[PDB]
Amino acid sequence: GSKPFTVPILTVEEMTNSRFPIPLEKLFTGPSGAFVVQPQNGRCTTDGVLLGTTQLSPVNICTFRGDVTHIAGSRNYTMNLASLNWNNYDPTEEIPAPLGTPDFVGKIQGLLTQTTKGDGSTRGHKATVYTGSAPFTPKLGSVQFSTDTENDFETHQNTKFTPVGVIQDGSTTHRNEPQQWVLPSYSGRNVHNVHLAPAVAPTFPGEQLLFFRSTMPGCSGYPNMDLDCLLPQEWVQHFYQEAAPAQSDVALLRFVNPDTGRVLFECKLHKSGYVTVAHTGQHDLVIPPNGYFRFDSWVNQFYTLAPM
Amino acid sequence: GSKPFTVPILTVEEMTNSRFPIPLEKLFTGPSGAFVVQPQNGRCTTDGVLLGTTQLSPVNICTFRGDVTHIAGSRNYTMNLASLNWNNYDPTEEIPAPLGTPDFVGKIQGLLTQTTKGDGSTRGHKATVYTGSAPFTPKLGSVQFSTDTENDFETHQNTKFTPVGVIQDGSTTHRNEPQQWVLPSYSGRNVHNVHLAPAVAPTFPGEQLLFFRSTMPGCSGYPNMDLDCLLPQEWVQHFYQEAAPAQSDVALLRFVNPDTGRVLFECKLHKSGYVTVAHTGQHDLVIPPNGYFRFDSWVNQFYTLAPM
Numbered sequence: 218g219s220k221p222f223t224v225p226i227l228t229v230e231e232m233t234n235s236r237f238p239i240p241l242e243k244l245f246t247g248p249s250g251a252f253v254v255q256p257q258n259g260r261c262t263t264d265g266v267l268l269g270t271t272q273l274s275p276v277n278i279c280t281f282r283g284d285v286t287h288i289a290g291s292r293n294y295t296m297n298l299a300s301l302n303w304n305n306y307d308p309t310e311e312i313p314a315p316l317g318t319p320d321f322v323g324k325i326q327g328l329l330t331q332t333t334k335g336d337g338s339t340r341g342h343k344a345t346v347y348t349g350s351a352p353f354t355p356k357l358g359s360v361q362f363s364t365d366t367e368n369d370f371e372t373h374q375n376t377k378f379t380p381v382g383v384i385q386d387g388s389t390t391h392r393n394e395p396q397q398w399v400l401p402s403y404s405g406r407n408v409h410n411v412h413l414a415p416a417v418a419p420t421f422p423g424e425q426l427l428f429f430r431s432t433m434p435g436c437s438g439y440p441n442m443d444l445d446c447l448l449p450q451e452w453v454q455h456f457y458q459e460a461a462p463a464q465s466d467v468a469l470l471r472f473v474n475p476d477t478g479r480v481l482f483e484c485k486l487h488k489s490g491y492v493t494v495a496h497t498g499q500h501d502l503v504i505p506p507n508g509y510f511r512f513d514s515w516v517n518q519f520y521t522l523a524p525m
Numbered sequence: 526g527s528k529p530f531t532v533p534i535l536t537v538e539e540m541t542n543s544r545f546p547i548p549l550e551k552l553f554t555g556p557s558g559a560f561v562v563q564p565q566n567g568r569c570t571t572d573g574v575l576l577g578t579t580q581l582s583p584v585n586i587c588t589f590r591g592d593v594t595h596i597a598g599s600r601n602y603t604m605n606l607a608s609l610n611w612n613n614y615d616p617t618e619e620i621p622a623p624l625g626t627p628d629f630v631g632k633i634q635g636l637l638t639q640t641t642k643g644d645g646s647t648r649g650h651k652a653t654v655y656t657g658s659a660p661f662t663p664k665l666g667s668v669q670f671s672t673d674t675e676n677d678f679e680t681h682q683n684t685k686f687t688p689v690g691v692i693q694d695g696s697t698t699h700r701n702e703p704q705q706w707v708l709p710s711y712s713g714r715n716v717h718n719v720h721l722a723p724a725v726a727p728t729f730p731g732e733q734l735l736f737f738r739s740t741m742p743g744c745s746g747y748p749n750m751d752l753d754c755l756l757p758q759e760w761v762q763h764f765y766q767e768a769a770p771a772q773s774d775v776a777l778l779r780f781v782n783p784d785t786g787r788v789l790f791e792c793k794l795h796k797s798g799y800v801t802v803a804h805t806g807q808h809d810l811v812i813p814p815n816g817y818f819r820f821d822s823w824v825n826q827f828y829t830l831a832p833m
């Protein structure tokens with residue numbers, strides 16, 4: 218008597234990255250035994266429980282909201298954060314950081330915009346947040362932005378950060394940042410992160426994670442623009458609504474080609490919200506534009522996949 | 526033998542505007558008899574046929590892709606457009622303009638970003654497109670951007686526009702632009718638009734359109750930041766996948782409050798993809814955060830709604 222489980226029939230290129238507000242481009246698999254894979258956005262169980270800092274909006278990912286204060290002698294501003302819905306932020310909520318907070322170390326550039334309530338005057342400036350920096354303390358309710366102005370922003374007026382892309386210091390090794398698999402210190406460098414969505418890894422020999430991959434825009438230097446999420450944002454929204462019970466640890470999915478009527482490959486969708494495939498090595502999957510995932514049956518962690 | 530029709534159970538504040546990449550904030554109704562309501566984004570039939578310039582990605586709305594050429598003596602660049610998927614753009618496709626093109630007259634500000642293929646060097650600059658301007662000819666394959674640079678962008682390298690918000694000329698009447706209900710001239714001022722999604726209006730006495738409303742960020746001046754769409758982007762994605770046949774002209778929806786178990790109001794979801802309610806005058810709806818739409822039955826255009 219369990220509600221039947223399903224995944225969306227949207228194709229990969231019809232879906233959105235859950236870790237940055239950009240479209241998916243491709244599927245990628247590679248080894249990740251050497252390091253911890255623990256993203257906090259795009260985390261959701263198959264029965265619809267949001268984890269980490271995951272929230273439902275594709276466009277709220279890596280945004281910030283609040284009001285700002287200027288740092289004299291600079292073009293830097295401190296943002297005192299509001300909640301996702303512009304109310305008072307509560308640091309004691311059982312989350313790692315405000316929902317939608319970036320979950321990787323990098324220099325994220327976008328625009329800081331503001332409206333003055335009284336007359337509806339507005340202003341917007343290019344701005345960058347360094348999520349690896351000492352003032353990056355979103356869990357404690359504040360982050361710092363570098364901007365292109367020393368005086369234009371007003372205090373105590375609603376201010377929004379909209380992300381666009383990432384930058385790198387071109388005097389250093391190319392593509393050495395961002396580091397998408399390094400979590401920020403949400404409460405600052407001397408404080409451990411809390412309430413995290415768990416790290417994920419394949420346990421089965423010869424299996425690797427299957428990533429939903431995008432390329433982040435670059436705004437300066439030579440950044441590493443690869444960005445891999447565990448679930449498309451549309452899958453997060455789907456499971457959240459459906460809330461179908463997980464009848465076992467693992468949902469077997471087949472990736473189907475409607476142009477031939479044949480299955481390209483099969484994969485495991487684990488109930489805690491990630492996908493694995495039977496393959497060894499780094500590989501950009503080549504898929505038909507009309508290809509889609511289809512849930513076929515509940516299996517478990519001991520199931521042997523056909524090689525990808 | 527028709528597949529059962531449904532709408533998503535996401536709440537309003539859990540969904541995304543289909544005309545700009547920002548969250549929904551509220552429901553709004555007002556009279557629109559005096560003017561033509563003909564948006565081209567967020568247009569989809571209840572049985573899943575995309576119309577106008579509508580595409581499936583919430584983050585692709587009001588983006589542009591292509592390569593750029595500098596205009597000497599200025600900080601202006603012409604973008605020769607690529608398709609939504611970075612291929613050659615075909616001006617003869619039966620659409621008004623490239624998918625995701627802005628469907629209103631306004632000055633849209635964001636970032637123009639670029640990557641050089643050979644070495645992975647990147648650059649990003651603040652940029653504005655005036656969709657009412659003479660060089661705004663997206664259907665013909667080109668638009669113009671004003672930027673903060675006269676020399677940094679390279680030719681013949683992939684270039685992306687990411688929208689953030691809107692601006693207004695502060696020397697003129699406040700909130701006189703953008704004009705969200707004025708379509709751009711997609712082929713320029715002397716050429717009529719083609720392949721448009723149709724204009725919509727209530728036909729029933731005492732009914733008005735029900736709008737899904739957001740506030741666009743403002744980046745300069747005193748802009749009109751109201752933005753009303755006919756369908757949430759998540760509804761577009763839902764109908765596209767479900768493709769449930771419309772058994773009549775009108776789906777009756779009830780907006781339900783789970784905190785009391787009572788219906789707040791009922792409304793008509795027309796098969797061509799828009800909502801009406803029984804109300805006269807401008808009104809910001811006040812709704813419970815957990816409120817949701819529920820499809821109850823197929824009726825038709827002659828059905829009399831309970832007053833909102």
Ligand SMILES: CC(=O)N[C@@H]1[C@@H](O[C@@H]2O[C@H](CO)[C@H](O)[C@H](O)[C@H]2O)[C@H](O[C@@H]2O[C@@H](C)[C@@H](O)[C@@H](O)[C@@H]2O)[C@@H](CO)O[C@@H]1O
Binds near residue numbers: 386387388437438648
């Ligand atoms: C030394 C330094 O950090 N300079 C950056 C500048 O980057 C340098 O730009 C050069 C050409 O303009 C070379 O490409 C150098 O390798 C590079 O380090 C940076 O310019 C941004 O990124 C570079 C790589 C180019 O893509 C530029 O087009 C782009 O604007 C600017 C912009 O923030 O800042 C310093 O001047």
Ligand SMILES: CC(=O)N[C@@H]1[C@@H](O[C@@H]2O[C@H](CO)[C@H](O)[C@H](O)[C@H]2O)[C@H](O[C@@H]2O[C@@H](C)[C@@H](O)[C@@H](O)[C@@H]2O)[C@@H](CO)O[C@@H]1O
Binds near residue numbers: 340
């Ligand atoms: C005359 C003109 O168009 N000036 C804009 C400037 O706007 C003026 O800014 C004043 C205060 O700086 C007053 O607010 C004027 O009413 C306004 O016309 C504009 O500044 C942007 O928008 C204004 C309304 C303020 O919100 C500013 O904070 C904001 O930067 C700037 C920025 O593009 O351009 C011209 O200088």
